[PDB]
Ligand binder design. Sequence first.
Ligand SMILES: Cc1ncc(C[n+]2csc(CCOP(=O)(O)OP(=O)(O)O)c2C)c(N)n1
Ligand SMILES: Cc1ncc(C[n+]2csc(CCOP(=O)(O)OP(=O)(O)O)c2C)c(N)n1
Ligand code: SF4
Ligand code: SF4
Ligand SMILES: [Mg+2]
Ligand SMILES: [Mg+2]
Lengths: 275, 275, 627, 627
Amino acid sequence: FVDWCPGCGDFGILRAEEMAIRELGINPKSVVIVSGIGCSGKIPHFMNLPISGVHTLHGRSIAFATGIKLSNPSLEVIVNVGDGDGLGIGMGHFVHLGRRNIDIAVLVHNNGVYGLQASPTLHRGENIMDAVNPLAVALAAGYTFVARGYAYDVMHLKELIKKAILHKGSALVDILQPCPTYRVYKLDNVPGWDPVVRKEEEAQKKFEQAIMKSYEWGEKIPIGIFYQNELVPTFEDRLTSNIPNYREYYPAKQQIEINGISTTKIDELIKAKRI
Amino acid sequence: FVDWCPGCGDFGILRAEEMAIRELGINPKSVVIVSGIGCSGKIPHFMNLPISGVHTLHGRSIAFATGIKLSNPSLEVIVNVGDGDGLGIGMGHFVHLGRRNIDIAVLVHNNGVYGLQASPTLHRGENIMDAVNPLAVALAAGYTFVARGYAYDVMHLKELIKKAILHKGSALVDILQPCPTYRVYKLDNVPGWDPVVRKEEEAQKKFEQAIMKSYEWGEKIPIGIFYQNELVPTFEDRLTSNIPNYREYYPAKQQIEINGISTTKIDELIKAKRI
Amino acid sequence: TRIVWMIGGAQGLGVDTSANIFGNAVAKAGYYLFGNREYYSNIKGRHSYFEVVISEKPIRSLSSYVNILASFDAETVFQHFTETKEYLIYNVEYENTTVDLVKSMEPEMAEQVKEALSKERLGFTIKDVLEYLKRRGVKVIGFNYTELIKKIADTFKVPMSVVERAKNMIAVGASYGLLGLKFDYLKDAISSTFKNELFIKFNTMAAELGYNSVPNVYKLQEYKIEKQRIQVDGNTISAMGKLAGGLRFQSYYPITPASDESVYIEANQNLDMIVEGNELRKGGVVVVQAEDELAAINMAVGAALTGVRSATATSGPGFSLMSEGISWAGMNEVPVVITYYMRGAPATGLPTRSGQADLKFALNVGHGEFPRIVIASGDHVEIFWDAIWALNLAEKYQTPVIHIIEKTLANAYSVFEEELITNRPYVIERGKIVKPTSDYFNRFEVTEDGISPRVFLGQASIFYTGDEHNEEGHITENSINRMKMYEKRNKKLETADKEIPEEQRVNIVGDADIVLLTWGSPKGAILDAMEELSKDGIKTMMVQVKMFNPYPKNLMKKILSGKSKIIAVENNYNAQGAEVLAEKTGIFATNYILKWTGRPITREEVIEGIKKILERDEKRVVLYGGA
Amino acid sequence: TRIVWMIGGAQGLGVDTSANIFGNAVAKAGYYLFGNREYYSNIKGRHSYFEVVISEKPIRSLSSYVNILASFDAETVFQHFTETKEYLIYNVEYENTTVDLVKSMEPEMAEQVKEALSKERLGFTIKDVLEYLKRRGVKVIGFNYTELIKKIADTFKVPMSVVERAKNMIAVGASYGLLGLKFDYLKDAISSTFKNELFIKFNTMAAELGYNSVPNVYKLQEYKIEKQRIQVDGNTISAMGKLAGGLRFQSYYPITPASDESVYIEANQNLDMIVEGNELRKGGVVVVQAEDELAAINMAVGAALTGVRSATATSGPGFSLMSEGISWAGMNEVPVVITYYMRGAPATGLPTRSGQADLKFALNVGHGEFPRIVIASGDHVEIFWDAIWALNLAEKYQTPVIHIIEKTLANAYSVFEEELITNRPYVIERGKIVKPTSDYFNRFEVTEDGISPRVFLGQASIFYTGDEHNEEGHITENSINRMKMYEKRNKKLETADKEIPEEQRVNIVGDADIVLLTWGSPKGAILDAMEELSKDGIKTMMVQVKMFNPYPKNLMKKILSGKSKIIAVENNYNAQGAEVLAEKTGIFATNYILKWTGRPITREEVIEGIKKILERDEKRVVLYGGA
Ligand SMILES: Cc1ncc(C[n+]2csc(CCOP(=O)(O)OP(=O)(O)O)c2C)c(N)n1
Ligand SMILES: Cc1ncc(C[n+]2csc(CCOP(=O)(O)OP(=O)(O)O)c2C)c(N)n1
Ligand code: SF4
Ligand code: SF4
Ligand SMILES: [Mg+2]
Ligand SMILES: [Mg+2]
């Protein structure tokens, strides 16, 4: 039973995520959606493709996703987290993924509350605490793709989510999404707007632009991509410098046993300790 | 025994913190230094005034400090944290203090390592992970005073630390500090430089400036104050709106018992549940 | 008189308030109540239900059967028809609705509904359920609720959609009608709950319609309430006792069973206090919503260093996160209470259901050996006094105290005599607090009893650290200091064990050769079960542990002595309470009555459990009733 | 032959490598070694020491006494003179240094040094210590180290400050000289450890100076090494067994006792593998330095969902943080090994010292009931095989396994026969893994034995959740599903308990009426102590538990039967291993030998403990030797 309230917002994200996976032609079997605790958390349980779901602890999705991805980089790993979930209980993990730049897309369901009390993205007043700009945190954390979407413009979202999965690195999509129980615009429509970094010397300029666009909010509320830089080695690129065949023979793929006997040789390890 | 390596850096911070407390004429009895795990962590144990020390869990100083301060706001509460400590294990607590704007000063000992492996403020290469700009994180988190100091210019540090304690709100001083076992400049010397917000309309401009100065690093490395805004109500200001006499009769001051009998009346609480 | 009513409906149809209105009316008539709320981890649409047990005498437990099931949808009928014994109130619009059309119902429940109907060759419609009920002497009372909502809308000249929620009060009106109590008490409980004049009048009409559509079947008479009576839940009563105990700092992270307690404290945070020279003064409790549980525990522990009585409240996932901070409080001999709302586990578990499966974890939380004082409340009145006791324990022994309250008690409510929580004085015992004589104070003096004199931050120079430390609080690795300090902290638990009477740590009721060994929420169901069993010549006694550490080991040896049956009754799979008895004394339970579904043990589950054990020495009776 | 050497010095004087050089030379001569490193939580300046026990036979324990104490500073003399039995090598420059001038020494140790000297009316200088030693037949051998460092600098025409560290090798040279073994082995162990030609030659000269300045007193002869021998620490051998067990993902957060293991894995992460058709292939172990322990546990658990054999390593504070993630692994039946380097606790505790004080926490970690398989290695060879066993246990029972290794074994090293870790085959048992027949797979099938067939992410559509769930992995609150699923996970522990021989879960040595009941690191000291006691006509046996869950309860009943003394020997205050025996069987230990200072139990502590108990029924012998 799809048990969210009528009105929600979460229906639009589900719909747009589903469409992103389909139109990419990614084999769904190889898609793991890793989601947090909250009403946002239920999501993969309600999809209509043979994707896999990992419904994790509150704020801990990114850490699970990390293990999954690094162990089997041929899986396509997507994190869906509520705003109480990431940003609240998971802020540290949220920042650190940014420094690693692992090939993962993270989707934050910004409803403004703990649906299932005030969340980290509720403005002061209206609540004793201030709100945080997820996009500015993500930028300073080192995320190599930062975007804002909006849950009602489904067709735009679908395409954000697509560019976010194709991004070679860590991607955030902060998604605006009303909670019924507890004017916008698009950077695709701006003639200047090139958020893509295409050579290294260009990087600071684009970063500085993203971070200032990300603060704009005087009901001239942008959406789309704020920053994108594929020149940053991924975490998987750095693993490959230490483990030459990581891509061809990653941990999930290796044969560790034949007829119940270890295939792993430690003779040289032991030899190095001889008297 | 003051057991840090000869060469350290931590000696300069100790010296400058000590001088800040002295020259303020704060009664030392009312000063609690709350410090994390690591060599940085030992610090209050080695001071020469009757200050109190709380040597806490790794990354958890800010949360302890919060309890201490809010329970007795007449204490002067200072957090000293290593870079592995805050920023690594404590990143979430680090961001959330920014949203609350509690009257606390936080001092980060940026040595670049886990002294007592690579830390969160070690640059990529030279280490599989990227570094984070503590100052940019602090700005996006909502810290109302953000500064960089340097551990060898002791006299400048001393005064940063002073302005950081006097700041009515949450203050960060990121402190640069070499670790022997594992050109700069000053914004006081810049003629433009006014980081103080003095009316509300001024706030975005100063914020935007701080955040871009905070990225400047092409061996033209600034130090001093990047941002300061005393117009943001403190957490203690917001408590006072709900608890009118919080300042005069805060939790640590209240008489809860006379001759072992509760002074607390719950009659009205119970009356409201009558049949 | 013991009459069990249930109402049910989709979450967010405000049926839970329907149930509080029904209870409020009955209570005003002089009846005691015990009430429970069952809900899914879900905001709207899933099936919730509300059992209310009615009696002229104080009532302590839920039952496996319902006398009167009130309903206005198809799903409530399907979820509770096998438990329904005397009357169904139902909506004739759903008579041809089949199980498969109830989309909000878990497929596991639909399968079980079909199984129960198939078992006696019935199909899967509401009509089939009505025959199932008629085979058992149940009288079914059908309403065209649509037509009644019409008639109300007609009267208030509104469209049906404004008054649709009044289905609830038609059901409540008719239920209350069966009882035979006078309408005024239901009308007053309506007026008193809703604010808006207009909600009041159409809901009143709806109750009236229900009430006048049924006969007076139970013929219940009014009773006079001699002593003031109160209606309270577990959360609220935990808050009441802490505030009474002098709590002035609480940090929490939202989590279903425990958020309520901290929100209640915060809504009432400005307390009247009668202070020196008998002056009224106001004092504020600081409540902080932490960003996670690690912060919650650590804010509380820091607060306490200032001399404030501090606490946090949480549930299993959150408790696990607090382990490190509890270990720090242990090492630094910090008074702090952790109210542990024990819910269905492991991991996220059953966020809205209950369990007793984290007792041993609680007794061993975090690394190192240090005193963890652990109590567990067995019913609502205990929660109040246990909350004050916890706070005093924490300051007397300068160490964390864990106060277990099962979810089941937090969301249950009961009506009882106010004097149970006002008659005895509210004693505050602050332990070994002293005035420092000079600027520098040794916080960790080695004394014979373990307990070091304590002063607060601000009063003199003191040091705390997570590392092993000497008497001044400075980092010390020295072997002999280590031997001494580590023993000193653990010796406090020996002091506690000498100073606290073992009789305060258990409730013993009866004297017999069959022992019902328990702790926590099953207390109530067992005491009710003992009376029924007594009347069929089965003598039993209850031994209910309140304080698991220090454990009442000599008293338990003396009591469980030559007993032929020791039946552990607990809401877990391993009988963790019996495991601690066995570790402390070598006495093993002979049999077990066990429930791990997340729903409370009922009176009748215990009666039938005990008979199954006496009449065939069944080793483990496993319970599973409740939707 | 059992000869105990110790060297000491300020941390960062590279004295620890001095000690590995001394050991390396002795070992090359044919002697077995057991070695230990003791250090402060401190990078430079504090006193570290290094005990090396030398024997022609394999050696298993440390001693409370030192035959030869090597020193070049004042502090090492002050810290170890009461333990020194045959020879002191010391620096005559410090003869008039008084205790009070040693600034780096904890004041608690200075007080104790003065106490021990005052006790027989001596003052507080090194000279006074020399008289203290002379009163006990100790021969003191003094060096003007300054004058020797001079002579070396003269030779290599450098200033004294380049060669100052060669004080270390003068001490090692003289120590080794006392033994009487030939210089070549010390010269080779020098050449082999340092890289730079120049370091080699001045350090060699320094050893030569020491060696030629002393007589051959022990007259030790060379022995032939028949079978290949290895020298390894606990960390490293844990890594070796995991890698051998097929580990390919480890996440960790730095923490002293366990960082070494993950750094060793990462330095050797590209492994040779002999794969299908006998092809050499390389395979890489992914090692991730997590930002905290919550991430470390959760990265590991996620990794395992892909079919990788994953693990993490940590110590007490970190373990506490992992509690929640372990509970999630339990609920979702995730194979994962947590290597638990148990150190001095609570809180930060003694970061560089050891303890056995977290066993019960480990057995009850996190909320809910689910199987937590717990083993604890008793010595270095066990660590290897226990590491492989842990990984197989995790996949056979699909649940977290905690592998306890005390800090004491991690930082101790020993020399033993390579074949102890190569002779038996390295068996990998992957449990109930299957090929999914279609697109959607039920990960949580209810079977009789508890264990659901498992497939990996990628192979078919599967679901995991922290909530209670049905067989497909979807959130389910249904009571009957709950009853079934929750039992099913716990039934695995019953299956484990049937399938694992109880004999594999304990080591029993001897047959006698006096039982030494233990687990973990005291194994070695007890086995050595038993032999010495045997030779004075005291018959004892050791019962050493390896697997605490499932606990070998029938075998322990059978064995501990009619025993008159059961002496629990553990490194904690509450005898937690004896507490679990008592919970599982009702058998109580009669006496205790206990140590909670953080330093290993020695052979002689056990001998004297056992005699104190036999000759006056002392209930608890509390130990405290070691600086
Ligand atoms: C460690 C832990 N702490 C707390 C909880 C309780 N909890 C569950 S859902 C919830 C609301 C979460 O809010 P959010 O992440 O904003 O998700 P939403 O429901 O708004 O999608 C809370 C507080 C838990 N399951 N685990
Ligand atoms: C919860 C927890 N995890 C890990 C540790 C182990 N630990 C102690 S000090 C240390 C180094 C800390 O580095 P940093 O915070 O950078 O401090 P520094 O020594 O560089 O001042 C580590 C990893 C601990 N005590 N507690
Ligand atoms: S609560 Fe708010 S968020 Fe959770 S479901 Fe109902 S609407 Fe969507
Ligand atoms: S290690 Fe690095 S930081 Fe810790 S003390 Fe020695 S120098 Fe200062
Ligand atoms: Mg949310
Ligand atoms: Mg640091």
